[PDB]
Amino acid sequence: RQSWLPGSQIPAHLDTPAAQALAGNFGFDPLGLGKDPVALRWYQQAELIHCRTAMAGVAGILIPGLLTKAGALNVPEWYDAGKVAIENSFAPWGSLLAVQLFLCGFVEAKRWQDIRKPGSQGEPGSFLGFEASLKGTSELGYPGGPFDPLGLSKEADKWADWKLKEVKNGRLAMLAFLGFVAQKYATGAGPVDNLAAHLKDPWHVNYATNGVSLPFL
Amino acid sequence: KRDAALPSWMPGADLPGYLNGTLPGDFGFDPLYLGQDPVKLKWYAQAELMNARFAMLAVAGILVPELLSNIGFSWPGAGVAWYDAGKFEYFAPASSLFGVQMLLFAWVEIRRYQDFVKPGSANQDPIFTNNKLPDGNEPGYPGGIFDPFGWSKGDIKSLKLKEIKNGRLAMLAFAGFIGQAYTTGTTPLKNLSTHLADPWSTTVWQNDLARL
Amino acid sequence: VRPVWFPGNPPPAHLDGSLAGDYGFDPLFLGQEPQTLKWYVQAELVHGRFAMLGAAGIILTSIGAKVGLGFPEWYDAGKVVVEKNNIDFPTLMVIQFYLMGWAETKRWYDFKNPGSQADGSFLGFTEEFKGLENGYPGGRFFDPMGLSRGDAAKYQEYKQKEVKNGRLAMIACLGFAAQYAATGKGPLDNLADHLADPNHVNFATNGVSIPIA
Amino acid sequence: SRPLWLPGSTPPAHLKGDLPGDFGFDPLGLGANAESLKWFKESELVHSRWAMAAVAGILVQEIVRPDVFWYNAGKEVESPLGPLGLLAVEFFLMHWVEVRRWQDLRKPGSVDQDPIFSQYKLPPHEVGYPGGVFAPFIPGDLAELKVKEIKNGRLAMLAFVGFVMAAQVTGKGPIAALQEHLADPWGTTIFSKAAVVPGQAVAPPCKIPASVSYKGIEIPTPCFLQGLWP
Ligand code: CHL
Ligand code: CHL
Ligand code: CHL
Numbered sequence A: 001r002q003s004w005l006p007g008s009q010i011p012a013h014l015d016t017p018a019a020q021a022l023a024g025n026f027g028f029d030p031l032g033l034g035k036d037p038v039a040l041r042w043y044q045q046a047e048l049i050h051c052r053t054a055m056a057g058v059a060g061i062l063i064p065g066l067l068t069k070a071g072a073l074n075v076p077e078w079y080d081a082g083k084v085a086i087e088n089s090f091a092p093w094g095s096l097l098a099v100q101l102f103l104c105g106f107v108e109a110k111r112w113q114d115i116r117k118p119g120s121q122g123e124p125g126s127f128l129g130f131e132a133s134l135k136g137t138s139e140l141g142y143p144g145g146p147f148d149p150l151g152l153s154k155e156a157d158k159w160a161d162w163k164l165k166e167v168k169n170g171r172l173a174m175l176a177f178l179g180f181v182a183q184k185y186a187t188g189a190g191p192v193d194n195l196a197a198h199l200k201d202p203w204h205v206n207y208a209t210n211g212v213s214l215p216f217l
Numbered sequence B: 001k002r003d004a005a006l007p008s009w010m011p012g013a014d015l016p017g018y019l020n021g022t023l024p025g026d027f028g029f030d031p032l033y034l035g036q037d038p039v040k041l042k043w044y045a046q047a048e049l050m051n052a053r054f055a056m057l058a059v060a061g062i063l064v065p066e067l068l069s070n071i072g073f074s075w076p077g078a079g080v081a082w083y084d085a086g087k088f089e090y091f092a093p094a095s096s097l098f099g100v101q102m103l104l105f106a107w108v109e110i111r112r113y114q115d116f117v118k119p120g121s122a123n124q125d126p127i128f129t130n131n132k133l134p135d136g137n138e139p140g141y142p143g144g145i146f147d148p149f150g151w152s153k154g155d156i157k158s159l160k161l162k163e164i165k166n167g168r169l170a171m172l173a174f175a176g177f178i179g180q181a182y183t184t185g186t187t188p189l190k191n192l193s194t195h196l197a198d199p200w201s202t203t204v205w206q207n208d209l210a211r212l
Numbered sequence C: 001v002r003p004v005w006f007p008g009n010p011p012p013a014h015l016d017g018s019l020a021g022d023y024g025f026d027p028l029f030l031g032q033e034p035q036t037l038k039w040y041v042q043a044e045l046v047h048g049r050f051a052m053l054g055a056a057g058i059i060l061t062s063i064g065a066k067v068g069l070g071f072p073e074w075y076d077a078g079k080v081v082v083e084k085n086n087i088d089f090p091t092l093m094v095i096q097f098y099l100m101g102w103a104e105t106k107r108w109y110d111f112k113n114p115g116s117q118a119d120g121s122f123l124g125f126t127e128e129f130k131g132l133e134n135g136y137p138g139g140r141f142f143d144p145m146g147l148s149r150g151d152a153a154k155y156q157e158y159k160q161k162e163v164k165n166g167r168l169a170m171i172a173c174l175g176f177a178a179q180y181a182a183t184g185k186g187p188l189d190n191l192a193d194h195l196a197d198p199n200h201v202n203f204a205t206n207g208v209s210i211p212i213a
Numbered sequence D: 001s002r003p004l005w006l007p008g009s010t011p012p013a014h015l016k017g018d019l020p021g022d023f024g025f026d027p028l029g030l031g032a033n034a035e036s037l038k039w040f041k042e043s044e045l046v047h048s049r050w051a052m053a054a055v056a057g058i059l060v061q062e063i064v065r066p067d068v069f070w071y072n073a074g075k076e077v078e079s080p081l082g083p084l085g086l087l088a089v090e091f092f093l094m095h096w097v098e099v100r101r102w103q104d105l106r107k108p109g110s111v112d113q114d115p116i117f118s119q120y121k122l123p124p125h126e127v128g129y130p131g132g133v134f135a136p137f138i139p140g141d142l143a144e145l146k147v148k149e150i151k152n153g154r155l156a157m158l159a160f161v162g163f164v165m166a167a168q169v170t171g172k173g174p175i176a177a178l179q180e181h182l183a184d185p186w187g188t189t190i191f192s193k194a195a196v197v198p199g200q201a202v203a204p205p206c207k208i209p210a211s212v213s214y215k216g217i218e219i220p221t222p223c224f225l226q227g228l229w230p
């Protein structure tokens, strides 16, 4: 029974067989946000969407950042790319965002109705014959079907392992983005530039000496 | 739980049970227990062959061309460092060659993967249906037309062991090329000549301390 | 029966002599509750063990200063080490709390749930963190020589020796602070002065401890 | 029943005379734990065997090569192999030898086989006393020889420590220091060059230089615990 803190008392609601079926369950819930079984089902979906969104976004800040330093690309800092892109753009940011909310809202709305009634989007005739493939799988938050082109979710032996990798990289990615935001205000430089500075002189270039994080010292 | 009769990377050491000598080069080396899960170890078995076989070709393709140049043999590609072959100008641009490379490799690799997923299912020529590989081949060892000289009909177990030993050494050598080239800044055979010129004062300890 | 801090006074009920260094000294009944007594037993040992390291370190460096080897006084070492070695104090402080925080959190949850740190969670170590008693980790990491796994009679004798040298060290560390505040000199600087003229050089004549003097 | 370090005393329970050189000396009870004694048994032999070779070498160096000070032999010696060339061979060769000896201590009888040559093998033996190739010739009874080995070995371990402190204080070799003692035995004892009493403390000066320049680098050379010298 792996736990975030050995010797601590795991919350009872996280030890139930339903709770232990969740990937990445290390008994971490000190504030008791998941005590209600109905709430935990909703928060699990929130983590998956935050996990997957964070991984896509971090990959879009980090991989372009390294290649930019390597000289294979020329991409501005993630906190400047918004301004640079909108200049040589076919639309203003107001129009671009409004479309984004229609498309994301429509797609998100279908996902929302599946949380309320799992498998309800396979209603015959609701879509133009495509509703059959929108039923999802038996596990909420793992749609599969058209979202799994290579069919990696059809191997029962590897299923639990895959879900653990996703949540682990997802949680790490979520913290990475929080680090990008905190390191922009703290240091006023890019993520890869901050890493370069730390590696040069680790013992003098860190948050303990940035003059922000520890105001008392 | 591993028997003591089998060769051991560290004599007198307990070794994992799942490394029971079935695979070639099974010396029980797995301090991190990476291959504990049989499904994963099934994948890692093929990855070692693929990384090894390419490494053997790559190392052969980095030493022999340089060895010929020193001997004086003259060809237009002579005198080009293994890490400068990319910059060299050929009959076609690098991009066009790269595009052809992926299209050709996409066919063969997916063909190889299909056998791994379902062994024996990719042993037939799509066009000339008469052609076919022997039905007894296992993943990673196609045989048939891939073994024209019939060497696999002899002591196969010894040959598999010899392949993986040479392959593992080749993989280490290539990592040496990257480390040495990135540090020394010269070709591999040049480093060997420097070491032979003065073996005692040319260790990596001497070389790296001087830099920092 | 057993000796007590105040001869003639019966020892408290909650102090039965089982613990090491028990002289029935608890005038304020701070450890009357059995569970709170476990917490303080370990608090005393940690305080005592640190004081022994502190006292030995202060004494040794003071000998280096008097002999002229160039060591600074214990009350100036911190400033000298940082400046001479060019160390960022806030970074050194943070590193200390990561290492102390990890090590000392493990000791915290072993007290709450004994044996919990020996479940193999930490790098697979399953027996070096099990613990022998309250405040006595044991094991082949904290007790490599196995002096707690040999003779049982002598191990109990050492527990008596550990606590009493720990209490003595704790008093000494208070002496270093009080003497520095009153005198402004190093530990062995005070000792040398006393040996010179013990009658006319002591706390009763420093002009501070006894203001009415 | 057997001679003891302090005649008339009772040896500790965990000491019973089974091991060679077992004279019942263990005031701190470091050998009480069975496993700890097994490890400490190995280290005593290794320490003693190294000391005997080291002590013999220092004496022979002074006789053969009086000019060179064994203390300064580290920097004085010059060889084509260079500083780091010598260290490289020493590290790899010692790493192999020590690991194999270490493995036998953990799991005896597992590293007796010769890796390269199959036919050759080490006969069964006790931990710390390899046989076969290591012991081509035995003058007499092993039991007597083992006692002789440790008693000479224990003396050698003290002898080497004597060289270091004599070298650091007198700044001379072992034989050279002895000749000084014979010249003026009364004025050369450690009592006759150091003394501490209430109010005064006199200690000998460290005669080894504070730092040593060796091929462009500075090697610290501190006297051992010079601050606590008498
Ligand atoms: C096993 C795989 C593999 C490895 C380890 C390398 C390793 C290397 N290639 Mg090579 N390549 C590999 C496969 C391939 N390469 C190429 C085509 C090239 C080219 C065209 C070049 C390299 C170069 C390089 C070096 C990059 C570091 C450097 O000096 O950057 C600094 C880069 C430069 C100074 C080059 C600047 C001009 C260049 C025209 C800009 C564009 C470069 C491309 C983005 C390179 C893309 C390579 C990718 C696909 C592996 C390095 C030695 C470069 C080299 O040899 O530099 C001396 C180089 O120019 N490779 C192809 C296509 C057939 C490959 C296909 O698999
Ligand atoms: C949900 C998040 C989460 C949180 C809040 C914690 C919180 C904690 N865990 Mg952790 N864990 C968490 C998830 C998990 N833990 C574990 C498994 C464990 C174990 C096994 C243990 C802890 C322990 C601890 C405690 C460490 C206290 C301390 O001072 O650390 C100080 C922190 C450090 C020393 C490490 C971080 C240092 C620094 C921030 C990063 C430096 C990185 C550089 C590469 C450094 C390089 C330096 C070199 C080159 C010189 C702390 C309460 C320990 C404890 O106290 O147990 C009782 C403990 O033993 N956790 C797992 C795996 C199942 C988790 C999975 O999500
Ligand atoms: C048993 C080992 C051993 C001992 C007891 C000595 C003892 C001595 N050497 Mg010698 N040496 C030894 C091995 C070696 N020395 C040298 C090279 C030198 C030089 C060049 C010099 C000495 C000097 C000295 C003297 C002063 C030492 C001092 O203050 O160091 C202070 C402490 C240090 C400098 C570092 C201490 C290191 C630590 C104890 C062990 C480190 C372990 C490694 C990290 C592990 C990896 C290595 C492998 C081999 C295990 C002293 C008499 C000096 C002298 O002559 O003074 C008058 C001097 O200049 N030695 C080599 C060749 C590489 C050795 C190889 O084994």
Ligand code: CLA
Pocket: B169, B172, B173, B175, B176, B177, B179, B180, B183, B184, B191, B192, B194, B195, B202, B203, B204, B205, B207, B208
């Ligand atoms: C295939 C293995 C192999 C071989 C035969 C060599 C050979 C050589 N290397 Mg290279 N090297 C290797 C792997 C290898 N290397 C790897 C994997 C790396 C990456 C870490 C490096 C990184 C490296 C550097 C940075 C330097 C060398 C250098 C050297 C030279 C020896 C002096 C030295 O400092 O060595 C250090 C090398 C090692 C300690 C190798 C350790 C790893 C290998 C796999 C150990 C194999 C041991 C095994 C018993 C087999 C021995 C060889 C076999 C043919 C009998 C010599 C030309 C130096 C040079 O060029 O001097 C002029 C130098 O500066 N090597």
Ligand code: CLA
Pocket: D050, D053, D054, D056, D057, D058, D060, D061, D064, D065, D068, D073, D074, D076, D077, D079
């Ligand atoms: C712990 C053992 C030890 C160590 C570390 C040293 C170290 C040293 N000795 Mg000393 N020596 C020792 C023992 C030791 N000696 C013993 C036992 C003797 C008596 C036989 C001598 C006799 C001696 C003399 C006469 C001289 C030295 C000298 C030296 C110095 C230079 C060595 C050299 O150039 O070798 C170069 C190496 C060779 C030419 C090849 C040596 C091959 C040997 C014999 C192999 C032995 C293998 C065997 C298994 C070892 C078993 C014992 C071991 C496990 C301890 C150096 C400081 C020289 C000096 O004073 O320099 C200033 C010097 O002239 N030594």
Ligand SMILES: CC(/C=C/C=C(C)/C=C/[C@@]12O[C@]1(C)C[C@@H](O)CC2(C)C)=C\C=C\C=C(C)\C=C\C=C(C)\C=C\[C@@]12O[C@]1(C)C[C@@H](O)CC2(C)C
Pocket: A028, A029, A030, A031, A032, A033, A050, A053, A054, A056, A057, A058, A059, A060, A061, A077, A078, A079, A080, A081, A082, A174, A175, A177, A178
């Ligand atoms: C979604 C996300 C990030 C998304 C990022 C995106 C899309 C970025 C996009 C872009 O960058 C690109 C690619 C390129 C740029 O040019 C443009 C932008 C547009 C900027 C992060 C979430 C990040 C989310 C984070 C950090 C959440 C952390 C939550 C924590 C720690 C909660 C802890 C606990 O709640 C538990 C679990 C249990 C309780 O009992 C106890 C407590 C402690 C309360």
